[PDB]
Amino acid sequence: MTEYKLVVVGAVGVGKSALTIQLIQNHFVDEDSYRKQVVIDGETCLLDILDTAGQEEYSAMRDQYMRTGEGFLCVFAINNTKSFEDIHQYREQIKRVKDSDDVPMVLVGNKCDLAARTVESRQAQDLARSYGIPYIETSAKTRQGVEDAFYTLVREIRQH
Ligand SMILES: [Mg+2]
């Protein structure tokens, strides 16, 4: 069957794992590869997701997994301005290693259940527009937009 190699990236603590675990095991963790047969738009397929460590110890450790990844979830948290500003560094790294200005990618603003937000939706939407990539807000806690984000990424890969 078609397999989709997806890679979840982002600054420490933004909810890369919570999003992956909500999708795969259907529960929010208040506190690494995953493989799952799913059916998306009638297509039977396997999601092979890499949930990357947050520690900036990489760049040679990062290049290996970015090279095999087909599409990328670039995650920041909406109560975390630094995690948002860090997004540019992740995209420029994916582009460097994949020798492409166009890589299937979705910008995800996670933790949209929280009221104490420091990054506004219009801000991130305008960023995503400049990249030419979709923007989707999620909450791994409420499960809002979780399937949305991953499925939109699969569809971006299908259109590449
Ligand atoms: Mg994690």
Going from the Cα of 17 to the center of ligand 1, the distance in angstroms, rounded, reads 4
Going from the Cα of 42 to the center of ligand 1, the distance in angstroms, rounded, reads 30
Domain layout of the chain by residue ranges: 1-160
17 marked as binding residue: yes
The owner of tokens 């095991």 is 25
- Tell me the two tokens of residue 74: 């670039």
Say how far apart CA 32 and CA 51 lie, in whole Å: 5
Going from the Cα of 108 to the center of ligand 1, the distance in angstroms, rounded, reads 15
Do residues 137 and 121 lie in contact, with contact meaning Cβ atoms separated by under 8 Å? yes
Q: Topology of domain 1-160, per CATH?
A: Rossmann fold (3.40.50)
Beta bridge partners of residue 109, listed in sequence order? 76, 137
Q: What is the 3-state secondary structure (H, E, C) of the chain?
A: CEEEEEEEEECCCCCHHHHHHHHHHCCCCCCCEEEEEEEECCEEEEEEEEECCCCCCCCCHHHHHHHHCCEEEEEEECCCHHHHHCHHHHHHHHHHHCCCCCCCEEEEEECCCCCCCCCCHHHHHHHHHHHCCCEEECECCCCECHHHHHHHHHHHHHCC
Rounded to 10 degrees, the C-alpha dihedral 41/46/47/53 comes to 180
User: Which residues have C-beta within 8 Å of that of residue 15, sequence separation ≥ 6?
Assistant: 75, 77, 110, 111, 138, 140
Going from the Cα of 12 to the center of ligand 1, the distance in angstroms, rounded, reads 8
CA angle at residue 97 from 46 to 139, to 5 degrees? 50
How were these coordinates obtained?
X-ray
95 marked as binding residue: no
Say how far apart CA 117 and CA 99 lie, in whole Å: 35
The b-or-e profile of 106-140 (16+ CB within 10 A means b, else e) is: bbbbbbbeeeeeebeeeebeebbeebebbbbbbbb
Q: What are phi and psi of 138, to 5 degrees?
A: -130, 160
Beta bridge partners of residue 35, listed in sequence order? 48
Cβ neighbours of 24 (radius 10 Å):
16
18 marked as binding residue: yes
Closest CA to 111 of 12, 34, 18, 25: 18
82 marked as binding residue: no
139 marked as binding residue: yes
Closest CA to 6 of 61, 73, 52, 95: 73
Do residues 145 and 19 lie in contact, with contact meaning Cβ atoms separated by under 8 Å? no
* Declared resolution, Å: 1.9
Using CA atoms, how far residue 54 sits from 15, 69, 126, 130, in Å, is: 10, 17, 25, 25
Beta bridge partners of residue 51, listed in sequence order? 8
Closest CA to 65 of 39, 89, 96, 97: 97
Cβ neighbours of 102 (radius 10 Å):
11
Closest CA to 72 of 36, 44, 108: 108
